[PDB]
Symmetry: C2
């Protein structure tokens, strides 16, 4: 039986579409382009640095990813504007069903936690700004292990902090590549697919594929 749930941050709980708008305000007409490439570089850099054994915290990785993005687009990025766009991640709005769903799952007595890339301080900030803080038992960052997902050492961390075995911790994520990693590790996996995307072809399939957190509650 699942006694705890490990949540993903962007795309699972919080909507990042906010950042797109904040980018377009900085560089009018380019918003969708900037945010699209910026997000991919953030992913790539965490993966690539992990393979090379050259870690840096997510904040740095986010700035670097933006710097490359603008340089690649022919956009001039000053320090001031770079901080603003980066601060945009600390002010995300959750998906509509999120608040109620979290309250209901906590009612059911499940231990809830968040495992993200950023510092614990920033993770706290996002959930506090959204007034959701009180619903989480653990706020985890990959920083302690100096590596990023899907390196299995990040998953153990989630397992250790929760004081439960992986088979009793539901891994919830909107990223198929992450759900694949979790699935290989041992966590029962729940893929959050809202916009009709397909699963990655790396030998895995999630235990459950849902369209929102509303469906997650029904499982309990």
């Amino acid at each position: 039986y699942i006694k705890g749930i490990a949540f993903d941050l962007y795309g699972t709980l919080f909507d990042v579409h906010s950042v797109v708008g904040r980018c377009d305000e900085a560089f009018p007409g380019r918003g969708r382009e900037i945010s699209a490439l910026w997000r991919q570089k953030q992913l790539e850099y965490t993966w690539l640095r992990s393979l090379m054994n050259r870690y840096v915290n997510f904040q740095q990785a986010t700035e670097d990813a933006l710097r490359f993005t603008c340089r690649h687009l022919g956009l001039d990025l000053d320090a001031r504007t770079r901080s603003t766009l980066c601060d945009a991640y600390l002010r995300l709005a959750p998906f509509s069903e999120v608040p109620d769903s979290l309250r209901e799952l906590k009612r059911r007595g499940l231990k809830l936690a968040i495992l993200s890339n950023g510092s614990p301080q920033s993770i706290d900030a996002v959930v506090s700004h959204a007034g959701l803080r009180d619903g989480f038992d653990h706020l985890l960052s990959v920083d302690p292990v100096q590596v990023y997902k899907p390196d299995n050492r990040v998953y153990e961390l989630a397992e250790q902090a929760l004081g439960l075995d992986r088979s009793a911790i539901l891994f919830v994520s909107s990223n198929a590549w992450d759900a694949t990693g979790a699935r290989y590790f041992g966590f029962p996996t729940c893929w959050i697919n809202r916009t009709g995307n397909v699963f990655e072809e790396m030998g895995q399939t999630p235990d459950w594929e849902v369209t929102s957190l509303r469906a997650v509650v029904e499982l309990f």
Copy 2:
């Protein structure tokens, strides 16, 4: 002094634009889309499987990447068509300056080698079809180490096969992320940038940035 050179395959020696056309013939009008996404998934899958410690040879990784690509685009991919597109990589044409440049570098007495993802048999096939076989001392695959780049264990392989120390082996590649990996490892790095792209923001800069192999010869 550089006594040997380790070459990258696609984009450095051989032009992959050929595959784009072969894709468009299979799915008329979609060629650029298919090949674009297919190449990114190939990269991602090698990286992601390496981090998860779940290796499979490049052939499998190429098929999976195509399967996802078509499924994601709403395209129906049968076995027959899947093999054809995959065979397209074994029939690439080199860049115009390549042949002469390789002949000239061998004239200068440098040990030349290729370090790619595919099987040694397929690597051999590409260079043989292009009539370039005789110019290479070593044809290397990552298969022996069961991991992909930029995992440092792949770079050591290139170092061991050549019987030289890394500082005496020029690492030539068209991929900035790979040049970063090599650079961190210890290899003097030469980035081949033909189409005016920018370098990745992961803390590195190549020793040389050139626009073709013609410039590589001038360095010696």
